[PDB]
């Protein structure tokens, strides 16, 4: 429909889901559709739990974690959430700088200056711009739906998306990166039945978009052993079979628009979680990381990995408020929803501690 499609294109609209989904296509091919599916499946549950808690308690999670918790724990949780928003803005700025160097060839620091003046221009109105960004992201989604029809190994795609298996540090690392990019703390911190159905259908169609992106990054070059896998400059140059000369600039414009939109979205979310200036303190790490002399191709995925590092500090407080009687009243969430959410909370920490043990080994 017109509602859910635009809602999905706006709600995902980030360079993290773009970068982490192309890495998985050229490192483990179709064997990461399981990661994508599990990610969206738990993201919808987290969205529903967050909405239920926010409505039945009358406050967002930043306002709640200030009610009943020790002050040092509040400081530690603010450290965690501010590092989360910081990494989100870092990923935004990195994706935008890469898109700018792909479009006009400007170096990533001049691209950061351009993104700063675009943030200045965010404040010839908001009505005309909201259609353009959503239209660009919807067009790139249709472009990848154009390609998902050509993947010859249908049953191989199904079998690789069906059987979950991880092998070594790279597989678990990229899986954690993707599952932390999809399930975002923005989602965790986000006619009621209409809103619920719209969000569910939107996230479902956007999960289809992500599966299409991963399957295309797998079928375009998996065994071709092309020069680079996750270099979004090399990705953009070979991303697409169809409508070639315009496809490269289309991909670059889509990346730039998604980055500039996620900029405002995540920055306003950080302002919400912070007041209950802001743009510069969350921007400085982006500049110091892209100036340190390292290519952003791997840091754009490490940022999603760190967002997954930050997901449990936003997941543990949710269910404790969810399961309560003197607050939820007669509208307490079921015990089975609780059990499913807690199995998910155990699984995420299992994967993250797996990666951490593998890093401790060396």
């Amino acid at each position, epitope marked *: 429909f017109l509602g859910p499609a635009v809602i999905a294109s706006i709600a995902y609209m980030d360079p993290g889901n773009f970068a982490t989904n192309i890495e998985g296509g050229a490192r483990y091919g179709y064997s990461l559709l399981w990661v994508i599916l599990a990610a969206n499946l738990m993201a919808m549950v987290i969205q529903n739990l967050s909405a239920n808690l926010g409505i039945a308690s009358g406050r967002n999670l930043p306002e709640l974690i200030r009610e009943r918790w020790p002050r040092p724990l509040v400081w530690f949780y603010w450290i965690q959430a501010e590092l989360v928003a910081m990494a989100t803005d870092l990923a935004e700025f990195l994706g935008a700088a890469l898109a700018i160097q792909l479009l006009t060839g400007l170096p990533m620091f001049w691209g950061a200056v351009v993104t700063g003046v675009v943030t200045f221009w965010l404040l010839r109105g908001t009505r005309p711009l909201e259609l353009a960004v959503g239209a660009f992201v919807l067009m790139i989604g249709v472009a990848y739906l154009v390609q998902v029809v050509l993947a010859r190994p249908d049953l191989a795609a199904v079998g690789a998306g069906f059987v979950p298996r991880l092998q070594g540090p790279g597989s678990a690392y990229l899986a954690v990166g993707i599952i932390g990019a999809t399930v975002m703390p923005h989602v965790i911190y986000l006619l009621v039945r209409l809103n619920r159905v719209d969000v569910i259908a939107a996230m479902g169609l956007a999960g289809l978009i992500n599966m299409s992106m991963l399957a295309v990054a797998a079928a375009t070059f998996h*065994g*071709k*052993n092309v*020069e680079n896998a996750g270099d979004l400059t090399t990705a953009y140059q070979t991303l697409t*079979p169809l409508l070639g000369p315009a496809a490269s600039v289309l991909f670059a414009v889509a990346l730039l628009a998604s980055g500039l939109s996620s900029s405002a979205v995540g920055t306003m979310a950080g302002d919400v979680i912070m007041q209950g200036l802001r743009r510069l303190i969350t921007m400085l790490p982006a500049f110091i990381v892209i100036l340190l002399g390292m290519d952003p191709s791997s840091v754009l995925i490490l940022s999603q990995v760190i967002l997954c590092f930050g997901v449990p500090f936003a997941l543990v407080p949710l269910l404790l408020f969810t399961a309560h009687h003197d607050v939820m009243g007669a509208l307490v969430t079921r015990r089975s929803f609780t059990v499913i959410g807690w199995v998910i909370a155990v699984i995420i920490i299992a994967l993250n501690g797996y990666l951490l043990w593998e890093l401790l080994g060396g």
Partner: antibody
Amino acid sequence: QVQLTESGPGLVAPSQSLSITCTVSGFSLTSYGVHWVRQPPGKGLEWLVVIWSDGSTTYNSALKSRLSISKDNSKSQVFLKMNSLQTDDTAMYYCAREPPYGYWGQGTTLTVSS
Amino acid sequence: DIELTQSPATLSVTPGDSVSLSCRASQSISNNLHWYQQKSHESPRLLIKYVSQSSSGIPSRFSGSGSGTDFTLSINSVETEDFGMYFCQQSNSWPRTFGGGTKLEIKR
């Protein structure tokens, strides 16, 4: 200087077993997926199989359920293995992978007759 | 299941006249091709990645020309070190498929 080398030629009876070592040097084997190519003398050649690093074996429909591909990252070797050999499987085997399939092995000869 | 038929089967020429091999496809392959030269009892080095992006360390003699379902590799001013086998391979969809092959020989 990047360089791939292979195992010495082999002469085996039918219904026997065999393995061939494709050892690499100069590049990171754990970062590139190796492809196999079978060429009988003058009889043309067709793409055989690909072992992407970390054990990801994908076989073609032409040669499936008979061949196997092991990998040993400790010495960076790719093992080709065959069981229940037939008469007309004699050929030279190649293993080749660096970024656009540039580097090929010198080739290992393999003959099967009683 | 996509195959590749190569023409001609064998080709004779004297040093000086340009040659051109055609690697006809079974369906549309979006500029996914590979050209290899080979000698007797040797290993084939890579010449042409996808189409006419002359590979690493390849003389400027060889040039590709690419379009959907029919690609052509041409050698201008054939020197004595260009005779032997030539092979064409697609790399888009499993399984990869090599062409019918050609053996460029000497003419007199």
